[PDB]
Design an enzyme around this catalytic site. Sequence first.
Site, mmCIF file in Angstrom:
data_model
loop_
_atom_site.group_PDB
_atom_site.id
_atom_site.type_symbol
_atom_site.label_atom_id
_atom_site.label_comp_id
_atom_site.label_asym_id
_atom_site.label_seq_id
_atom_site.Cartn_x
_atom_site.Cartn_y
_atom_site.Cartn_z
ATOM 1 N N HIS A 1 0.820 -1.208 0.000
ATOM 2 C CA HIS A 1 0.000 0.000 0.000
ATOM 3 C C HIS A 1 0.870 1.281 0.000
ATOM 4 O O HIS A 1 0.629 2.178 -0.819
ATOM 5 C CB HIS A 1 -0.966 -0.038 1.202
ATOM 6 N N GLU A 2 1.861 1.357 0.914
ATOM 7 C CA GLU A 2 2.764 2.511 1.051
ATOM 8 C C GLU A 2 3.574 2.707 -0.209
ATOM 9 O O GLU A 2 3.593 3.817 -0.756
ATOM 10 C CB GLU A 2 3.640 2.420 2.320
ATOM 11 N N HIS B 1 1.407 4.219 -2.954
ATOM 12 C CA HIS B 1 1.412 5.697 -2.891
ATOM 13 C C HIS B 1 2.660 6.239 -3.575
ATOM 14 O O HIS B 1 2.537 7.136 -4.420
ATOM 15 C CB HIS B 1 1.351 6.200 -1.444
ATOM 16 N N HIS C 1 -5.878 6.579 -2.745
ATOM 17 C CA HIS C 1 -6.790 5.605 -2.151
ATOM 18 C C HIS C 1 -7.943 5.303 -3.087
ATOM 19 O O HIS C 1 -8.402 6.198 -3.807
ATOM 20 C CB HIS C 1 -7.344 6.118 -0.822
HETATM 21 C C1 LIG Z 1 -2.243 -0.664 5.265
HETATM 22 C C2 LIG Z 1 -3.452 0.431 5.520
HETATM 23 C C3 LIG Z 1 -4.529 0.268 4.315
HETATM 24 C C4 LIG Z 1 -2.473 1.844 5.470
HETATM 25 C C5 LIG Z 1 -3.636 2.876 6.180
HETATM 26 C C6 LIG Z 1 -2.937 4.399 6.296
HETATM 27 C C7 LIG Z 1 -2.687 4.707 5.069
HETATM 28 O O1 LIG Z 1 -3.490 4.948 4.089
HETATM 29 N N1 LIG Z 1 -1.338 4.756 4.757
HETATM 30 O O2 LIG Z 1 -0.886 5.076 3.520
HETATM 31 C C8 LIG Z 1 -4.165 2.553 7.680
HETATM 32 O O3 LIG Z 1 -3.165 2.482 8.508
HETATM 33 N N2 LIG Z 1 -5.266 2.417 7.911
HETATM 34 C C9 LIG Z 1 -5.846 2.134 9.319
HETATM 35 C C10 LIG Z 1 -6.615 0.681 9.290
HETATM 36 O O4 LIG Z 1 -7.372 0.476 8.553
HETATM 37 N N3 LIG Z 1 -5.927 0.058 10.432
HETATM 38 C C11 LIG Z 1 -6.572 -1.331 10.792
HETATM 39 C C12 LIG Z 1 -5.546 -2.583 10.959
HETATM 40 C C13 LIG Z 1 -7.223 -1.027 12.058
HETATM 41 O O5 LIG Z 1 -6.520 -0.795 12.939
HETATM 42 N N4 LIG Z 1 -8.648 -1.033 12.132
HETATM 43 C C14 LIG Z 1 -9.403 -0.758 13.321
HETATM 44 C C15 LIG Z 1 -10.400 0.427 13.001
HETATM 45 N N5 LIG Z 1 -10.471 1.241 14.310
HETATM 46 C C16 LIG Z 1 -7.019 3.303 9.660
HETATM 47 C C17 LIG Z 1 -6.015 4.709 9.778
HETATM 48 C C18 LIG Z 1 -7.963 3.594 8.489
HETATM 49 C C19 LIG Z 1 -7.570 3.061 10.941
HETATM 50 ZN ZN LIG Z 2 -2.691 5.203 2.229
#
Ligand SMILES: CC(C)C[C@H](CC(=O)NO)C(=O)N[C@H](C(=O)N[C@@H](C)C(=O)NCCN)C(C)(C)C
Ligand SMILES: [Zn+2]
Length: 253
Positions: A184-185, A188, A194
Amino acid sequence: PDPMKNTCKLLVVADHRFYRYMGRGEESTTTNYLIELIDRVDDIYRNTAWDNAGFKGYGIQIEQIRILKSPQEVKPGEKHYNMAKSYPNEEKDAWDVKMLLEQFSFDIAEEASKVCLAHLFTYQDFDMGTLGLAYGGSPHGGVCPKAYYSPVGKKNIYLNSGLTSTKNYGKTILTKEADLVTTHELGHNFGAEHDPDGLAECAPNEDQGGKYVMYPIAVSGDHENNKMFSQCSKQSIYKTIESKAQECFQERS
Ligand SMILES: CC(C)C[C@H](CC(=O)NO)C(=O)N[C@H](C(=O)N[C@@H](C)C(=O)NCCN)C(C)(C)C
Ligand SMILES: [Zn+2]
């Protein structure tokens, strides 16, 4: 595709947190983890047809792994991405993610100028489930060092950076989860934004294979689309590769 310019070479950095918690205080354990993760990530990229035809075979390879065994000693008021304490709030397990990526970019500037991408691997629990961050595909930066004069830093930094943490909610994430964070990173960095809910083709329902890797919410690599790039990501990255491979991509080793 140019086979002489089809690979984005990486500088991979393992901080002291990664060395201690993922490497179990061993260099071989640290490097093996990273070599295997990048290679599985490389399989996703290399097998992707960016134009849905023959524009495939583009990937990533590690040029160098920097292993930071101990925290970076800092003077009062001075910060470093590898220092012992978290910034801006020392009482937290982790840095503010955006400040960490900016700090990493500042400290790694000289090395980042010589590689297609620099990637930081850490072990810290970012607030609210965040797993990583990167420059590029934002609504500048990404593949090939692009200078940015930092008014705060008082020097040029390069925007060819990103980071992955393998810690979330007090535990080590699964290797199948970590592979997806880095994919994913780097996505970007390769120019993808996204995947939006408003485009069903790019954000399918669970019974239609589920989400693609560029979805903003983390996917556990159990659904069919989770380890793949959407048509939205492919369109964005196709344009980046066309413009950027001649600039800094190299021949596959
Ligand atoms: C690998 C993921 C797709 C990277 C994204 C951050 C992002 O777009 N970085 O480029 C993320 O950390 N997403 C988190 C996510 O989905 N983390 C999961 C593992 C989570 O902790 N989910 C629980 C929801 N409270 C968010 C910030 C949306 C909570
Ligand atoms: Zn992202």
